[PDB]
Amino acid sequence: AAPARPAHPLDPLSTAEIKAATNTVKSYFAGKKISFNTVTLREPARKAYIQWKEQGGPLPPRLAYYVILEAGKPGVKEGLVDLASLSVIETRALETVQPILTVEDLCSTEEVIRNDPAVIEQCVLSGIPANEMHKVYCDPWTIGYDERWGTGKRLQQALVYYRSDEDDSQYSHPLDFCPIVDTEEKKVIFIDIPNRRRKVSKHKHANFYPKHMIEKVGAMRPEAPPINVTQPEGVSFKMTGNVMEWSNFKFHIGFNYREGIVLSDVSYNDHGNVRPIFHRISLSEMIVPYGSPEFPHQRKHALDIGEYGAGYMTNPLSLGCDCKGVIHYLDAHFSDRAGDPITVKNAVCIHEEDDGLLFKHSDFRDNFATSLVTRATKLVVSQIFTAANYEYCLYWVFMQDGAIRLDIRLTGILNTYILGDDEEAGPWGTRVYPNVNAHNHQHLFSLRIDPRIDGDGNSAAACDAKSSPYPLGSPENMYGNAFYSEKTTFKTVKDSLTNYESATGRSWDIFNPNKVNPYSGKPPSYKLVSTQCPPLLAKEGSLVAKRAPWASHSVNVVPYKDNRLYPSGDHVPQWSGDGVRGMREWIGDGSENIDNTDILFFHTFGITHFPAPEDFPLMPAEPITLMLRPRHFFTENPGLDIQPSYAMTTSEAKRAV
Amino acid sequence: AAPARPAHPLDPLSTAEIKAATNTVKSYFAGKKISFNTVTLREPARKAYIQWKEQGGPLPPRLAYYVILEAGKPGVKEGLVDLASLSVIETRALETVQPILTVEDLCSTEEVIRNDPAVIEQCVLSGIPANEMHKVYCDPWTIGYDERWGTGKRLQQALVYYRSDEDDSQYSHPLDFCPIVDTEEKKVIFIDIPNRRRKVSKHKHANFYPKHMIEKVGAMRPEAPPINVTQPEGVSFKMTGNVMEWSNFKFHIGFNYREGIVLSDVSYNDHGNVRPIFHRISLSEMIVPYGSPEFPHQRKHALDIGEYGAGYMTNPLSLGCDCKGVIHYLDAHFSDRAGDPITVKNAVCIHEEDDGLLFKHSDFRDNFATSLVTRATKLVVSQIFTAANYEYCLYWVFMQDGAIRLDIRLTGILNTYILGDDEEAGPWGTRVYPNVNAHNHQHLFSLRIDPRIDGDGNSAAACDAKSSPYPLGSPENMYGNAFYSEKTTFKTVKDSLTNYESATGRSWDIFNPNKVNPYSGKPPSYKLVSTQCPPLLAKEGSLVAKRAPWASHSVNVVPYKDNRLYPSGDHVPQWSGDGVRGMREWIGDGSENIDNTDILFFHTFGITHFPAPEDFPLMPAEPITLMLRPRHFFTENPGLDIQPSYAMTTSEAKRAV
Ligand SMILES: [Cu+2]
Ligand SMILES: [Cu+2]
């Protein structure tokens, strides 16, 4: 009957559980024609999980969340399957939303536009013959939002390009028009055609493979001498199923279709006292809003996580190329449209790397013969996903001082639009190649942190450096040097709505106000140190601001409730941004309490991208980082019991000489 | 007679040249008693150097700058020796300044205070017997500035500590008083004694060697499995003397007593067209202002570079511990007080390291079988210097996209002051251990860039992201998404006085307005991307603000003139900060032109440090970074001729299957 329960309640659904769930759902809707959009773990309620983990409490039921389509019905249906009983236990119909676009939902759009007589006609008017349609390509995007259709049809917009040869990078040769495609009917329903036509570029393609480069600059550079990294005695980390242990950290590595990597149940072993830090941390949403106002480019503000899914887009990583060293891989499992499990192999890679010095000090008194050096090791848990033109590289990094860092590297290819011979790209974009306009855009991310700093009952605060308010020459600040950290504890949701401030080098504390560090007298905290925090440039009330209400502040703190995962809502595509859902729901009237309770902390960070020709035709990795670091959590540097790489005391140096 | 001329005009003075210079100076002042404070290269004028390098021009004379003391004379004398003729060619007496504190100037202070009857008396009143003076230690600082003496005597202040055993870290046990020491007479002249006395701590020392840790937490962690890095075929970089070539970059690695590493004559080989980038780049000054207003702690605002010297303090680095891999080392050479050359071995280490992915893109169309991945290598040029309690790790990093990064890691030990059993440390510091107050402070750095972006004639600009000024719903910004980069070109010095602004994610361009990128139509630039840019917290008119006028803005741009190296002046210790010198001189009335000329760009960056117990007794490395990146410099990604680690085209993938 039922599938084997997993090793651990947070383990993603196995392939057997996916198939059991889709069989269950097919049987419940017997005699209807349905297709599967999502089949994923419904994670246990936080209270249920903690109680199970730490209080000998009830085993949470193993549940699958499903989203389906039914042919000839608007929207979706979603629900929950109880896997132990193979039954649907909750179900409902959402006729006015549209769900995440799966690989299969997107794969057919290129062939739909290649065979559509109106599209062919535009290709011909653009300078491509009717019988060279096999040379016309498109990146199929959600429509994002178009007020001519709402969510009343499920729609894609095709960003159209041309390839002279199948091995070309197509992005040097965009076309001027934009077909709109009905996803369920597989038909073009409209084409946005600009008032000013620009025909396909006559220039050579802007290419980047070795054979192209040899033609273009004459020769490749010689293969460089190798740099080889080995771990002849193995790795210091230990995985048990999905559970990681490394350098006193323990946590669960989960994965899903939408967020990608999800780290849960994170603790640190402080000499035998195992101390919780975070219940869950992941990226919960994104938005990449373009900054050209001209129609139809307002529809370029992909929320990649909610609209395509960081798991669904994730690359199979391979040994050597993506992750070098000694690697532990995890696979990812999803459902396809027919309810059959699909596997992405090696979706997550886990390894440890040297990370320079952890600490050092030497005494000048014996010319530095008294010296201690200890080298650092970091642990890396990563994936790389491809959102059509762009590549996002995600690196969750654990460090031996007890900090946790998220590092991202952006690479891939600029989104490009066509530029006429006499057209100025600025001020909204950059001509990065002849006839190629790369529009301005931001890449913004919502980091979702569910904390339990040293246990339950937490608060959050902005921390601003400030000069003493007493003036120079006063008895209280005679020489005018006094300064302090001003801590503003958030009491209600509204207090939390804050941005990064350079003027004060603002950081944010997440802390446990029920405890006290015995040395400093402050509460144990993890401090968010993050300065890549762009303002949202789109205006208040804009489509972008409405669809991504989380993106308007660097920090949003709300009460925990179950299933507050996705801050632009559960079903993102084609939402106008009007209505009380996601973060706008969780914020409410701003008055609910967030001091010393179960909270959720959503941080908006990222970059603002003004393209330049260095970015083209393929972009050098661009870095983004944030860090969560222990402050007043420990009573001293927690890495001092790591064997030093070199250590000589004063007594020892005297004996040497 | 004369020393052999060096391989290259920017090469630091060899040991022979140092000795020739000090012999020359001794002979010029024959019959006087003098001691040497500094003997260093006087680098050639910029015009002379460029003309020599690129225009077949005159060989610049080989010159040594010297600073001396004469016994019973106030201040210093400084001048220039022409090494080819062994003669002093310029000389003058500066009776009202005090020079950099050398290792020998500082080394005797501990024994001076241990033998001074008034100090002994304070030790006894503090709870240390007169016959345990061998247990009293001090870190000898410049006085920094004390208005009771000006520059009329050469002074140090001793921060006094106690060690129960010679192998203790002394910083858990500071004492409450501060002796003031005449550097030339070797005598204590005054002791600052607080109104409230605090006697020495009775607690155990807060120690961090393995033997201490075993006592404290029971055992060390096991030695971790090794991670070994080899380059069996050698390195891709090439050094010829001090000249580096790596990945199309070429530059000269210099070193001096004050700045440490100085990178000069930096170019990039763009497929045979060798393009200058920077003439010189280095750290030119620092200040580390503490934020307790209570006397005498206002005197804690070390300008480490100008007051002690990043070269003078620099550690001998050793293979494996400090720098692992295959390393090329340089030595540093200085003069001691008698005019004899001293050598620091392995002061600079140079190596290359894997740096993850340089770029990647895959095509979803064949499930990512069409794919290209190229891994990145970085080149690292570093030193580590010790400023008594703290360690500064400096890493100049060259990257294969043509960017240059400065990374710094701060480690070592917090400066500590004594805290009474019932004394609250806040708001000016943190009790990080019983009876230990670690005061708040900033660490600020002045990066000095002398640019020649694609040749001579440069400008600088602030770049601010801005939303369109047209409102949502207008024909010009119908959906409110439009945004652009607002460029403010600095025309006069005053325009340049700018800070980092989070509101606009400000970056700064250094550019050549006489040239144009053929694709984008913009001038070639290097962009300073830097967000660790604290405001100076000390007040206007404060001692800190006056002594470090550069620190008040993130960016200061001034005209080039020869010998505009050190922005708090040439002789820093005991300057009150009153007077037109350093940056305040170079800024002038703010009106001189800085558009399209020879300019100097000084950037103030760093961090604001609120200590916590994680920092104690030895601090985990804290990171600081900035980057200078090519934008509109190249016409495409300059690393695409690097062999990929993996590459498969669409045609190739089809054949595989
Ligand atoms: Cu971008
Ligand atoms: Cu500090």
UniProtKB/Swiss-Prot annotation, chains A, B:
<keyword id="KW-0186">Copper</keyword>
<keyword id="KW-0560">Oxidoreductase</keyword>
<dbReference type="Pfam" id="PF01179">
    <property type="entry name" value="Cu_amine_oxid"/>
</dbReference>
<dbReference type="InterPro" id="IPR000269">
    <property type="entry name" value="Cu_amine_oxidase"/>
</dbReference>
<dbReference type="GO" id="GO:0048038">
    <property type="term" value="F:quinone binding"/>
</dbReference>
<feature type="binding site">
    <location>
        <position position="609"/>
    </location>
    <ligand>
        <name>Cu cation</name>
    </ligand>
</feature>
<keyword id="KW-0464">Manganese</keyword>
<keyword id="KW-0801">TPQ</keyword>
<feature type="binding site">
    <location>
        <begin position="387"/>
        <end position="392"/>
    </location>
    <ligand>
        <name>substrate</name>
    </ligand>
</feature>
<comment type="subunit">
    <text>Homodimer.</text>
</comment>
<feature type="binding site">
    <location>
        <position position="450"/>
    </location>
    <ligand>
        <name>Mn(2+)</name>
    </ligand>
</feature>
<keyword id="KW-0576">Peroxisome</keyword>
<dbReference type="Pfam" id="PF02728">
    <property type="entry name" value="Cu_amine_oxidN3"/>
</dbReference>
<dbReference type="GO" id="GO:0008131">
    <property type="term" value="F:primary methylamine oxidase activity"/>
</dbReference>
<feature type="binding site">
    <location>
        <position position="599"/>
    </location>
    <ligand>
        <name>Mn(2+)</name>
    </ligand>
</feature>
<feature type="binding site">
    <location>
        <position position="598"/>
    </location>
    <ligand>
        <name>Mn(2+)</name>
    </ligand>
</feature>
<keyword id="KW-1015">Disulfide bond</keyword>
<keyword id="KW-0479">Metal-binding</keyword>
<dbReference type="GO" id="GO:0005777">
    <property type="term" value="C:peroxisome"/>
</dbReference>
<dbReference type="InterPro" id="IPR049948">
    <property type="entry name" value="Cu_Am_ox_TPQ-bd"/>
</dbReference>
<feature type="glycosylation site" description="N-linked (GlcNAc...) asparagine">
    <location>
        <position position="228"/>
    </location>
</feature>
<feature type="active site" description="Proton acceptor">
    <location>
        <position position="304"/>
    </location>
</feature>
<feature type="binding site">
    <location>
        <begin position="302"/>
        <end position="313"/>
    </location>
    <ligand>
        <name>substrate</name>
    </ligand>
</feature>
<feature type="binding site">
    <location>
        <position position="441"/>
    </location>
    <ligand>
        <name>Cu cation</name>
    </ligand>
</feature>
<dbReference type="InterPro" id="IPR016182">
    <property type="entry name" value="Cu_amine_oxidase_N-reg"/>
</dbReference>
<feature type="binding site">
    <location>
        <position position="443"/>
    </location>
    <ligand>
        <name>Cu cation</name>
    </ligand>
</feature>
<dbReference type="InterPro" id="IPR015800">
    <property type="entry name" value="Cu_amine_oxidase_N2"/>
</dbReference>
<feature type="modified residue" description="2',4',5'-topaquinone">
    <location>
        <position position="390"/>
    </location>
</feature>
<comment type="similarity">
    <text>Belongs to the copper/topaquinone oxidase family.</text>
</comment>
<feature type="active site" description="Schiff-base intermediate with substrate; via topaquinone">
    <location>
        <position position="390"/>
    </location>
</feature>
<dbReference type="GO" id="GO:0005507">
    <property type="term" value="F:copper ion binding"/>
</dbReference>
<dbReference type="Pfam" id="PF02727">
    <property type="entry name" value="Cu_amine_oxidN2"/>
</dbReference>
<dbReference type="InterPro" id="IPR049947">
    <property type="entry name" value="Cu_Am_Ox_Cu-bd"/>
</dbReference>
<dbReference type="InterPro" id="IPR015802">
    <property type="entry name" value="Cu_amine_oxidase_N3"/>
</dbReference>
<protein>
    <recommendedName>
        <fullName>Peroxisomal primary amine oxidase</fullName>
        <ecNumber>1.4.3.21</ecNumber>
    </recommendedName>
</protein>
<dbReference type="GO" id="GO:0009308">
    <property type="term" value="P:amine metabolic process"/>
</dbReference>
<dbReference type="InterPro" id="IPR036460">
    <property type="entry name" value="Cu_amine_oxidase_C_sf"/>
</dbReference>
<dbReference type="InterPro" id="IPR015798">
    <property type="entry name" value="Cu_amine_oxidase_C"/>
</dbReference>
<keyword id="KW-0325">Glycoprotein</keyword>
<feature type="disulfide bond">
    <location>
        <begin position="323"/>
        <end position="349"/>
    </location>
</feature>
